Amino acid sequence: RLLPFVSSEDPAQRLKQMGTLASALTELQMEFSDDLTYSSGMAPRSANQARFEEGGMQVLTKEDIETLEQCRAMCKRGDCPPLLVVFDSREGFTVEADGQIKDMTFIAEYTGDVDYIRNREHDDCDSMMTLLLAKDPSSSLVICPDKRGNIARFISGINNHTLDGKKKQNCKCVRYSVNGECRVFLVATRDIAKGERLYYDYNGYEHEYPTQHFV
């Protein structure tokens, strides 16, 4: 079952954490957005229907929905998860734990503008994320945090080409149906210590992300 995150107790530390995110967003010319956003110029909210997912989509349970809403409310009142955005010479911006994060803890929703994959065929963004994979490829959707987004777009991925790379993975990106809509969330897959860098698998489903050069 999903567990809510435990925000750092010192308010100064939460301030620092949010500051590191604000500066990274600024560097990438982005605004902060902790929800999926829709528009008629791209993909209307009505296109996001989990029943369109080829082969079906797992449904988030009432209990885990309650936990998701607790976490969302915490973020809005200023209790963010204990995470620091830090520049790394090899990886660029990366995300690391700034407090303990237990196995099964909700980390973040992957947010940004939602759009049709067919509309992003020629897009250079390095942070596109699958939202809905439909039988008809012209109905499939992607999340694009190129203009708006949150901390999730800064999390690193593993090298899918090395025997040792999977050993680094300490969280997982999953897609769940919530009130009938697709949603993408990140969850810890083991206990994570302070200072530890977060990594998930960019190629969970489709293998559309090149990682042979990753550290």
Binding site: M57, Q58, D126, G157, V187, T189, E206, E208
Partner: peptide, 12 residues
Amino acid sequence: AARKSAPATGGV
């Protein structure tokens, strides 16, 4: 395009 992706079944 380069696209990250996640499963829609199988839990965590």
